[PDB]
Amino acid sequence: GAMGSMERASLIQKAKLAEQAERYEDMAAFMKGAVEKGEELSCEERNLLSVAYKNVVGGQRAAWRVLSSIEQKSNEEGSEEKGPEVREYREKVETELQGVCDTVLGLLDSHLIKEAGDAESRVFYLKMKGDYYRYLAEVATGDDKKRIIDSARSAYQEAMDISKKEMPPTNPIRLGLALNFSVFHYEIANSPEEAISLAKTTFDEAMADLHTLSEDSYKDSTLIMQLLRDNLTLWT
Amino acid sequence: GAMGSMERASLIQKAKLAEQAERYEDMAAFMKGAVEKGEELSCEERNLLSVAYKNVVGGQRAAWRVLSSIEQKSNEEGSEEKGPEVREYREKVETELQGVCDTVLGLLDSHLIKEAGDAESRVFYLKMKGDYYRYLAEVATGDDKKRIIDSARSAYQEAMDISKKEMPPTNPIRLGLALNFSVFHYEIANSPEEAISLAKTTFDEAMADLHTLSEDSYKDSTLIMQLLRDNLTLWT
Amino acid sequence: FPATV
Amino acid sequence: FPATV
Numbered sequence: 001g002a003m004g005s006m007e008r009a010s011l012i013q014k015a016k017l018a019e020q021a022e023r024y025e026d027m028a029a030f031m032k033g034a035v036e037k038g039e040e041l042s043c044e045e046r047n048l049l050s051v052a053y054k055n056v057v058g059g060q061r062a063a064w065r066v067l068s069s070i071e072q073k074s075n076e077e078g079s080e081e082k083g084p085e086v087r088e089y090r091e092k093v094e095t096e097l098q099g100v101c102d103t104v105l106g107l108l109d110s111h112l113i114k115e116a117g118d119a120e121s122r123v124f125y126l127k128m129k130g131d132y133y134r135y136l137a138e139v140a141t142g143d144d145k146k147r148i149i150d151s152a153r154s155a156y157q158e159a160m161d162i163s164k165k166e167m168p169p170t171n172p173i174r175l176g177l178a179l180n181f182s183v184f185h186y187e188i189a190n191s192p193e194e195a196i197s198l199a200k201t202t203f204d205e206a207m208a209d210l211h212t213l214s215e216d217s218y219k220d221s222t223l224i225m226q227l228l229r230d231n232l233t234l235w236t
Numbered sequence: 237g238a239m240g241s242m243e244r245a246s247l248i249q250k251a252k253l254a255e256q257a258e259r260y261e262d263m264a265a266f267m268k269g270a271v272e273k274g275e276e277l278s279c280e281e282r283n284l285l286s287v288a289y290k291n292v293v294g295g296q297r298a299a300w301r302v303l304s305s306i307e308q309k310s311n312e313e314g315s316e317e318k319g320p321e322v323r324e325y326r327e328k329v330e331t332e333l334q335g336v337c338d339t340v341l342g343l344l345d346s347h348l349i350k351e352a353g354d355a356e357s358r359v360f361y362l363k364m365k366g367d368y369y370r371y372l373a374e375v376a377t378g379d380d381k382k383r384i385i386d387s388a389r390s391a392y393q394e395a396m397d398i399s400k401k402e403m404p405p406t407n408p409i410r411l412g413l414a415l416n417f418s419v420f421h422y423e424i425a426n427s428p429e430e431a432i433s434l435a436k437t438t439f440d441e442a443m444a445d446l447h448t449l450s451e452d453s454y455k456d457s458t459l460i461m462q463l464l465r466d467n468l469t470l471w472t
Numbered sequence: 473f474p475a476t477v
Numbered sequence: 478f479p480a481t482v
């Protein structure tokens with residue numbers, strides 16, 4: 001722990017500064033340090049953790065896609081052999097991405113999930129666990145790909161079961177979980193019909209609960225409902 | 237040299253891949269490895285080197301500015317003491333920026349500039365030397381700030397002298413050098429009148445040489461002339 | 473790509 | 478900020 005000597009509060013403060021500066025690798029390192037202090041995370045702190053690693057891995061994923069696309073073209077019929085470099089560099093980025101995912105999954109397993117008892121924390125962390133196994137699945141090709149997919153599915157499913165029992169249908173964590181699990185079905189599990197059914201049912205059940213919300217809660221829930229609709233429009 | 241075992245050509249290939257993937261830290265590391273092979277750099281290779289480090293340090297500079305702004309506000313009359321964290325984190329980013337600048341300056345000094353005899357290479361490298369001392373000057377506050385400023389000035393001046401003797405007034409390297417030296421005068425050296433005079437004279441002398449150019453050369457030169465005009469509009 | 477949050 | 482290249 002290179003952050004072991006820094007105060008928990010100072011790590012959280014610096015994570016917020018790193019966010020303002022769009023220094024997401026730093027932000028993630030600060031929040032990893034905060035998690036490793038061993039205390040549970042508040043709502044704000046959980047979101048700082050998630051924002052940081054989502055941005056880091058999101059950039060890695062975008063780079064991996066560029067390189068994979070180049071690599072596939074180099075392997076078409078008619079391409080001039082360019083040697084091992086495209087594969088090597090795609091592998092380099094892939095290994096770094098896998099490392100970040102393993103780091104996040106390790107934090108969730110030691111010991112964020114096991115201490116998370118409230119729905120808003122436990123569902124949040126199990127969603128993250130599904131998300132980072134989903135990112136591992138995006139690059140997986142070996143003996144382990146099915147198991148990685150099933151690990152993502154299992155985490156999402158436990159999160160879904162808790163969210164349906166303990167949260168209203170407009171809860172933004174519940175909505176974002178369903179959005180992402182629907183994408184898992186479409187893009188990872190080769191289950192587009194499940195993806196579409198989940199997005200549509202989630203949208204409709206949220207619609208019917210909007211009347212209970214304040215203006216600020218309404219704005220948050222309708223934002224993610226619009227993402228559900230966006231995906232449905234892409235898929236139908 | 238962590239790139240010491242990779243072929244020069246492979247490093248250049250991977251720098252281009254990193255560029256396509258917007259992985260500029262990787263790009264810079266690959267091009268540092270290529271420089272350290274000891275051979276002179278071609279035109280394309282010089283630009284790969286410059287693009288990589290310009291993007292890395294540009295992101296550092298943007299982050300430093302965000303953090304410096306926050307730090308200055310924390311020091312206004314009426315602010316609540318937030319402790320050492322803003323200063324510490326600004327210092328962290330500053331030290332990383334200084335490190336990147338020192339790395340680039342080290343490559344130019346060992347041994348790119350001393351082997352550069354053609355105007356297009358020597359002016360290009362001396363411009364880079366002025367640019368990276370200028371970035372050091374932007375964060376400098378100590379006994380060394382005047383010397384850093386004079387190191388930037390000296391490199392820019394040698395580049396200017398060569399460019400006026402050996403390049404036409406529309407040459408894009410000559411134009412970009414003048415653009416940046418003009419910004420040095422305005423932002424670093426507290427010489428706005430020199431900045432304005434240089435931008436205006438550079439623009440006018442280029443205008444009078446456009447008639448000699450092909451359509452493609454015209455597009456390149458007029459692009460940078462428009463940046464000169466943009467700055468003049470900002471400053472007058 | 474589809475939207476995730 | 479002013480333009481540089």
Ligand SMILES: N=C(N)c1cc(-c2cccc(NC(=O)C3(Oc4ccccc4)CCC(F)(F)CC3)c2)cs1
Pocket residue numbers: 019043044047048051124127172173175176177220221223224477
């Ligand atoms: N970045 C910072 N400094 C801070 C962020 C917060 C904060 C505070 C409360 C809530 C949130 N966000 C969310 O609960 C989620 O995101 C949303 C996305 C769209 C609309 C509503 C919520 C729900 C969906 C998701 F997938 F689980 C991701 C998280 C964040 C405090 S500080």
Ligand SMILES: N=C(N)c1cc(-c2cccc(NC(=O)C3(Oc4ccccc4)CCC(F)(F)CC3)c2)cs1
Pocket residue numbers: 255279280283284287360363408409411412413456457459460482
């Ligand atoms: N990125 C890549 N893969 C590749 C880039 C090249 C390449 C090839 C030739 C020229 C250039 N560029 C330039 O000489 C400069 O930039 C310009 C900026 C605007 C208009 C014209 C030139 C002139 C001004 C400056 F300040 F010295 C920066 C460099 C680059 C080949 S490959």
